[PDB]
Each structure stands twice: as C-alpha cells, then as structure tokens.
C-alpha cells in the first residue's frame, strides 16, 4: 500500500478498537447493574424480558399477545 | 410489591435503558467509522477480520493457522 | 501428518459436511413450512413464539408471565 | 378462530415441532462427531474452521486471505 492508506489503516483500526473498548465498558456496567439488581432479589431474566418488551411497539405487542392467546386457546394447549 | 421495590425497579430499568442508549450510540459510531472506511476504498469484512484476529492470542492464532495449513495439506484440499 | 491421519481427516471432514447438508435441508423445509403457514394468514413470529414456549416448562412459563405482569403493573 | 383453523393450527404446530426435533438430532450427532474428532487428538475449532471455509468460494477465500495478509503486513 501507499503511506496514505497505511496511516488511514492505522487510524481506522485504532478508532474502532477504542470504540469497542468503550462499548465493552458499557456492557460490563450493564452486567454490574444486573448483578446488584439480582443483589436486591429481582429476577434478571424477567427484567431482561421487560427491557425487551419496552422497546417494542405497544400496539403490536398487545397484538402479538392477543394472537398468542388466541392460538393457545385454539389448540387447547 | 412494596414502595421500596417499586422505586428500585424504576431505578434499575432507567439505568439499564440509559446504558443501552450509550451502547447503541457507540455501535452507531462504529458503523459510521466502517462507513467512511469503506468510503476510503477499504474492505470492511477484511477489516473486521483484522479486528477479530487482533483480539486473539498471537501464539494460539499462529498455532491455529499452522494446524489449519497442516489439515488443508493433509487432505489435498 | 501421517497417511492414516490424512485419510481419517478426510473421513471426518466428509462426515461433518454431510451432516451440515442435512441440517441445511431441515432449515430449508422449516422455512417452507412457515411460508405455508403465512400463506394461510397466520402470524409466523407468533407461531415461532408458540413453538419456543412449548419447549419451556409450562409452570415456569406461566410463572414468568406472572412475574412479568407483576413488574409491569408495578411500573404501569 | 373456527374449528378448521384450530385443527390446521394443531397440524402446523406439530409439523414444526417434529422438524425441530429432527434438527436437534442432527445437532446432537454433530456434537458427537466433533467429540469423536477430538478423541483422536484433533483441534475441533480448526476443524469447524475448515468446514466453514469449504462453504465459501475458494478464489474469494484465498483472495481475502491475501488482503488480510496485505493489511497485516501494512501495519506489521
């Protein structure tokens, strides 16, 4: 490669690595939060469920819940 | 639940949501970096490959490369 | 390597590849099944949800649903 | 729903569940195969690497390896 692409390559790699570090840090902090959360007697799986359903559209969520209920009753299961 | 667990639940949820936001932001920034990187004529897949192999132990990496080469030659493929 | 390990390696690789092919077939067929499911006006995502929750223990399922609802009501 | 869609739903669910079971069998067998592979002193990860790279086009594989090496040499 040329000197330009060499320096650009080093730059890109370094910036990406830094961002990955910050990202990893955030992830670890989240894990810490869930750890103390479990440290207060909360169900982490259910908490993650709440987080997952609070990102979804409420209308489509309640829709999928209604359809779900419908399907479960439709088969007797 | 009791008022304590209610407030703690709200707190946990809010903090986790914030951390998720920061995390998402970091991810988006990474995507931006790879976008301008591709904007300079670089192979993003290969870049990700470099990032992935720069996290691994060099000794075990070169090991797996030697073993790989060995296996490929062993079968004529 | 020695010739023995070479032939054995070829064997292993072939075995794994064949199993991977069969796995691919299964996945493709499943894809076709869900396509047939939506072709009759069914929600594929919800169907997958039904399948995934039928793998879980029912008592723990209705339990986790109860805890979920409890928390959601706790925060509105 | 109507009785027809109820029976059809039962059918679909059963079909999907059976396919999932067969898929599980395939995965379990693969697990057994790699266990047999390491039982003869082979690197399972590297074997999986061989399998995964044999799915890719060889020209593009050796090409991506060349670009990789080029970049790594470019940065040492």
Numbering used by the authors:
A (entry chain B), B (entry chain B): 12 to 88
C (entry chain A), D (entry chain A): 12 to 87
Text from the published report:
GapR is an essential NAP in Caulobacter crescentus involved in DNA replication, chromosome segregation and cell division. In this paper we present three crystal structures of GapR from C. crescentus, crystallised in the presence of double-stranded DNA with a sequence from the origin of chromosome replication. In all three structures, GapR adopts the same overall tetramer ring form as seen by Guo et al., albeit with small but important increases in the diameter of the central channel. DNA could not be visualized in any of our three structures, but DNA could be detected in gel electrophoresis, indicating that DNA is present in the crystals.
For this, we used both full length GapR and GapRΔ1-11 (a construct in which we removed the first eleven residues, that were predicted to be disordered) and a 19-bp dsDNA oligomer with a sequence from the C. crescentus origin of replication, which GapR binds with a nanomolar dissociation constant. We were also able to solve the structure of GapRΔ1-11 from crystals of space group P4322. Diffraction from these crystals also showed high anisotropy, with resolution limits between 3.3 Å and 3.8 Å. Following ellipsoidal truncation and anisotropic correction using the Diffraction Anisotropy Server10 the structure was refined to an Rfree of 0.322. There are six monomers in the asymmetric unit, arranged as a tetramer and a dimer. The tetramer could be overlaid onto the I4132 tetramer with an rmsd of 1.9 Å. Crystallographic symmetry again showed that the dimer of the asymmetric unit paired with symmetry-related molecules to form tetramers. Furthermore, in the I4132 and P4322 structures, a 19 bp DNA oligio would have to adopt substantial bends to thread through the central channel of adjacent tetramers, because channels formed by adjacent GapR tetramers do not line up. The main difference between GapR in the three crystal forms arises from slight changes in the orientation of helix three, which results in minor variations in the size of the central channel.
